[PDB]
Amino acid sequence: WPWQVDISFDIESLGKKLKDLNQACYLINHAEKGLGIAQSAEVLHPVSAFAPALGTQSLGDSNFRRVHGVKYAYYAGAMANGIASEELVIALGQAGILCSFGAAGLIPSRVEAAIKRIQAALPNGPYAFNLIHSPSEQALERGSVELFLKHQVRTVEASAFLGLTPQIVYYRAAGLSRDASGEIVIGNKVIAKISRTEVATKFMEPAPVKILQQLVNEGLISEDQMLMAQSVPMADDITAEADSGGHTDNRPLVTLLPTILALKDTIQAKYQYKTPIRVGAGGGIGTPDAALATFNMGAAYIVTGSINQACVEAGASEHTRKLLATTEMADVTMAPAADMFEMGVKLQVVKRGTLFPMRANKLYEIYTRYDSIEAIPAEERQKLEEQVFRASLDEIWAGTVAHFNPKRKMALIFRWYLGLSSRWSNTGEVGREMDYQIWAGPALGAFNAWAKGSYLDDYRERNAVDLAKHLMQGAAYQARINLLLSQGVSIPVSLQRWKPLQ
Amino acid sequence: PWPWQVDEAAISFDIESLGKKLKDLNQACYLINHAEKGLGIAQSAEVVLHPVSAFAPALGTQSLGDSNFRRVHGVKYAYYAGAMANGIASEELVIALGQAGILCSFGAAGLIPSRVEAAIKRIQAALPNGPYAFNLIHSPSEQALERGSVELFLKHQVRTVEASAFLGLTPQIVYYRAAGLSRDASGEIVIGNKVIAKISRTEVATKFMEPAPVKILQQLVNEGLISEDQMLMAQSVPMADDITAEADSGGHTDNRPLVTLLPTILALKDTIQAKYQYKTPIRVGAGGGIGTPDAALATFNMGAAYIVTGSINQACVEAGASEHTRKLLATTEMADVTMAPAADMFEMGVKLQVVKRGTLFPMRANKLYEIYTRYDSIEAIPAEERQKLEEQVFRASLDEIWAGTVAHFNERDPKQIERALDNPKRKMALIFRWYLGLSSRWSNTGEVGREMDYQIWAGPALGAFNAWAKGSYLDDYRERNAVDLAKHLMQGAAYQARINLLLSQGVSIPVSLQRWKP
Ligand SMILES: Cc1cc2nc3c(=O)[nH]c(=O)nc-3n(C[C@H](O)[C@H](O)[C@H](O)COP(=O)(O)O)c2cc1C
Ligand SMILES: Cc1cc2nc3c(=O)[nH]c(=O)nc-3n(C[C@H](O)[C@H](O)[C@H](O)COP(=O)(O)O)c2cc1C
Ligand SMILES: [Ca+2]
Ligand SMILES: [Ca+2]
């Protein structure tokens, strides 16, 4: 290196200079004091190692930040039933951070209200809305899309898809237009969250002609839109969702992400889109360490979820938040999902401080083993009635009927619990604590452990914005440390990691 | 920020040339954003003609991982190929890796002592100065056997053991460690017998990071097995030099996320190292999920001293696995693995990670656990379900299987047969375990006609590998050499570090150059 200097061997000061990512670091050894650092040099103590000013903006894909209009290559993933609440979106968006409104499970009127509120607060973004695939209820998907289009909601996080549907195709294609120069403008942005290559492929490739044609025919998109749709991917960003809270197939981040990046390279080479497809990732990200790891694999951006439910902005009860602050990595497990209960799908939930997973598991065993509720041995039937429902199955069924084969009846009854248990947690239903269904992964325990001993120990002091900052600033910090280490600098262990001190 | 300038015609804008130069890790890279032709790159600069807008130093694989790991183990990369049972991590594998300066752990688990001794002799002939290791697997039921292995290792001066499946210390692993301790000419401690402990739980890591306890040491001294000075020395050095954090992986696993497990173990390391202040610090590396350069890089950059591979090595021509298996393994995609009942600890619900494409083992094994748990006894299994097992799985009556098992365990370990009845559950388990046991052997040896029952250990790392490799010469199983894979992961990781660097400076690197490809 070409520099020399004439500052500093003061350990506390070493920490301060290292942590200022807005300034370059010039490193000196000598003897003693034996590692020194300066923030200015000149083209006579020469310089042994260097780190440039590289901050949070240096992580991830700059195009992600440009396209979404955000300060970080980060987003807070949707959380069902308004858990990713209006307050959450607004707080994050006010900070220049992307967040997906948790539309899943909410009624249309509720979603409309959220749109209005969010748009009032964030007239020029950033924000996204969750569009969840609803296999059983196509009309509902159509409805959400119409709403989004009606209000010019420009960004959607598409999740739980098994491939394309006419509704997501419609959203995508309806946003396309030509600029003065004749180039395609992609007005409706899509972030497709996936865990399989088969589905990723569908979103990385253009929409099919036949679906497009029907949309033209139905008067939903224009001929040119149909044409344009054939030359742009179905999503701008692909979120690889590894092992995570909620619905998940438990794939390792370190294998999923690389696999999807491989796929990306393949598709990009084949289509040569003018704007390259981006691949980001989530699932397991609760620390600076994990955040950096994910960027380091080639993630365009990172996604958090579990840690955000723990924050004061989230639509989750005080009880629940409090409990989330104590939840360790061993305190989560797989349990039956209300959605696709019948096929045995499971989701990752909290199992300490609640009996939900045991109870859900019981409902599945019973559902699968009996023909009808009548076949359930008056025996365990009565314990269910006592411990789970707190009312005869018949009475549950009556309520259900007012909310409007025997196997189907049994499911409908059981889904009362599977469904309401999530609501109970979200709203804080008193006396129903032991039945709270609370979605979370190992990310949360990771976070908690990382934060132990800090101000973050108090659930009341957890703000989504702050968490984002820690992950991003921490990652950036640790990137600098790696750079110096790579060069043979002896950074003291106590400075090697970003910890929450303030 | 950059104090150099560069004369044109040293610069290229050529994309073929960009790639070549980026990939040359022995030379630094000076980048310039020219009005045109845009991105340029040179490998020499002035110091005052265009100014430099981005830089990457010459930094190669040696900057990855812990240099002490390399010095201590006498290897050229901070990497090791993990043990694979029943000789899957074969003599051929160990030799090929060791000959290249790459650490490999011989798969001694399940092999008989004479076989292990033969292995030792062959390996030591080929590698008189290393590097190599031997797997010492904990056998909770069978301390005499663990004892024999250590005895064999000490006899032949096998200096490096990969200690796996431990739940804590045992007198055998302690003996191994302590017996290797000597003084140098200055009186300093020499750690002759190196130990790499592979763990997934903090409770176990802790034991291996701390010194051997007084009580066991004292015992060894009393038995005449180690000297008093060796006992003294043992109190100042860790039980293991290296701790491998094993995340989600092929074979036995508790499916821990690498991105949460490794930082947890590193933090523990820091704590213990700070407490004991060992002259040579304890190190933590990691495996589980490492099948690509991206993953390798991220792992190093989390703080791993080294990386460990396992699933990908089984796929290589040196592995002690059948040609059929190896060929299969090249077809395995990331979702083509699943958890299945383990033969070892079947009854306790222990599972392991196996291939589920091109073999029905997992489906069949899972069915067995289902049946075992559901029914009181073999006689209670619905006639037609039991029939389908006999046709499709056992290829014989359950009573014929039982017959063989009795005969077998009566010559080997009659305790099982005794214990197992009156108690139909245990008898049923014993019968089912016949399949769980042999299915591995079938794969390893390539039993003809038992292809759909092959038990083949593997995690998603293999799938990621296959995806990474797709379209390359590596598509052909016959072209997969362990050394080559190691080198690809190491060099690729180095390459990606440079790419990341440059990207972080805002350099527009073409998508096709962002990842290291075969
Ligand atoms: C309580 C909770 C609710 C969630 N709800 C949704 C949802 O409705 N739709 C969706 O696509 N993802 C949902 N997610 C997934 C997150 O958006 C994110 O992808 C995931 O949580 C990241 O993994 P992590 O849990 O390891 O952080 C939810 C996650 C949690 C923890
Ligand atoms: C087929 C196979 C056999 C293995 N046998 C052993 C063994 O006998 N002892 C052991 O400690 N680890 C064993 N392992 C684990 C590997 O040594 C290594 O730790 C692990 O495979 C790395 O994770 P990965 O599968 O994601 O690469 C085995 C792994 C595989 C795939
Ligand atoms: Ca999820
Ligand atoms: Ca394993």
Side-chain angles (χ1 to χ4, degrees), chain A residues 213-273 275-338 340-342 344-361 363-368 370-378 380-381 384-403 405-407 409-414 416-422 424-458:
Chain A
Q213 185 64 64
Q214 176 159 357
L215 293 173
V216 172
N217 289 350
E218 290 186 349
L220 302 179
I221 67 175
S222 74
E223 285 292 344
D224 204 14
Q225 285 169 329
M226 165 165 183
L227 177 55
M228 290 187 282
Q230 285 168 68
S231 284
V232 300
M234 268 294 308
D236 315 282
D237 294 284
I238 309 292
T239 301
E241 198 196 43
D243 182 45
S244 57
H247 290 276
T248 182
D249 53 10
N250 305 290
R251 311 203 182 274
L253 190 45
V254 291
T255 62
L256 177 59
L257 176 48
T259 297
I260 307 305
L261 283 170
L263 178 53
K264 178 195 83 182
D265 289 349
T266 296
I267 301 216
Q268 179 66 31
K270 168 183 194 206
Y271 291 93
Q272 313 237 69
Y273 298 127
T275 301
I277 43 176
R278 297 173 304 264
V279 175
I285 303 178
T287 63
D289 308 87
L292 185 48
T294 308
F295 288 117
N296 280 346
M297 292 192 268
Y301 59 89
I302 70 176
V303 174
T304 56
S306 289
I307 66 174
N308 304 310
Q309 183 178 37
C311 291
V312 303
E313 302 93 358
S317 73
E318 193 153 28
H319 175 82
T320 297
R321 272 185 280 116
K322 184 171 190 179
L323 183 54
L324 287 170
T326 60
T327 298
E328 297 167 359
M329 303 205 261
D331 294 328
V332 297
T333 198
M334 307 296 299
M340 284 154 299
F341 176 58
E342 277 141 284
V345 315
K346 316 199 111 218
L347 35 62
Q348 199 152 213
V349 300
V350 174
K351 73 161 172 185
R352 169 186 304 261
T354 167
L355 289 179
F356 169 79
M358 180 273 292
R359 293 172 168 168
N361 280 306
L363 292 182
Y364 185 72
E365 198 213 62
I366 293 175
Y367 170 82
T368 63
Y370 306 107
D371 275 345
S372 63
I373 57 160
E374 268 81 40
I376 310 171
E380 60 179 324
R381 179 172 162 158
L384 274 187
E385 281 166 356
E386 169 185 278
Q387 307 267 337
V388 180
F389 296 100
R390 294 179 195 182
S392 178
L393 299 193
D394 295 329
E395 175 164 359
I396 299 292
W397 179 243
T400 301
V401 166
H403 222 56
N405 47 3
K407 256 267 188 294
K409 187 182 167 186
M410 179 157 55
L412 280 191
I413 291 172
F414 285 6
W416 177 92
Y417 180 81
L418 298 171
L420 295 174
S421 57
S422 277
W424 289 336
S425 178
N426 304 343
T427 65
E429 182 74 12
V430 182
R432 277 292 194 168
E433 298 87 349
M434 284 326 283
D435 296 300
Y436 282 9
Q437 164 174 184
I438 309 167
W439 297 3
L444 175 66
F447 175 74
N448 286 335
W450 170 86
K452 188 60 172 167
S454 85
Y455 71 97
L456 298 161
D457 272 1
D458 186 348

Side-chain angles (χ1 to χ4, degrees), chain B residues 178-194:
Chain B
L181 300 178
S182 75
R183 299 277 177 184
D184 69 8
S186 291
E188 290 306 298
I189 298 178
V190 179
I191 302 171
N193 292 342
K194 299 156 306 179

Side-chain angles (χ1 to χ4, degrees), chain B residues 81-86 88 107 109 135 137 162-165 198 244 246-251 287-290 308-312 314 456-461:
Chain B
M84 308 177 277
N86 297 105
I88 292 167
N135 189 206
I137 195 147
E162 179 181 24
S164 67
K198 193 155 68 182
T244 303
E246 209 202 17
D248 187 82
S249 64
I290 307 183
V308 178
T309 60
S311 291
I312 69 183
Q314 192 179 25
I456 310 168
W457 297 359

Side-chain angles (χ1 to χ4, degrees), chain A residues 1-3 43 50 54 58 195-196 251-252 254-256 258-259 262 264-266 284 289 293 296-297 329 446 482 486 493 497, chain B residues 1-4 47 55 59 63 248 259-260 263-264 267 270 289 292 294-295 298 301 334-335 460-461 464 470 500 504 511 515:
Chain A
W1 301 101
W3 295 283
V43 173
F50 180 68
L54 294 175
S58 68
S195 72
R196 305 294 297 269
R251 311 203 182 274
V254 291
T255 62
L256 177 59
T259 297
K264 178 195 83 182
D265 289 349
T266 296
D289 308 87
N296 280 346
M297 292 192 268
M329 303 205 261
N482 279 319
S486 73
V493 177
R497 288 151 114 157
Chain B
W2 310 110
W4 304 285
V47 172
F55 178 69
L59 285 164
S63 70
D248 187 82
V259 302
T260 60
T264 299
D270 290 344
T292 61
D294 325 324
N301 284 355
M334 75 168 188
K470 187 184 25 90
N500 282 353
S504 78
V511 172
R515 267 164 286 292

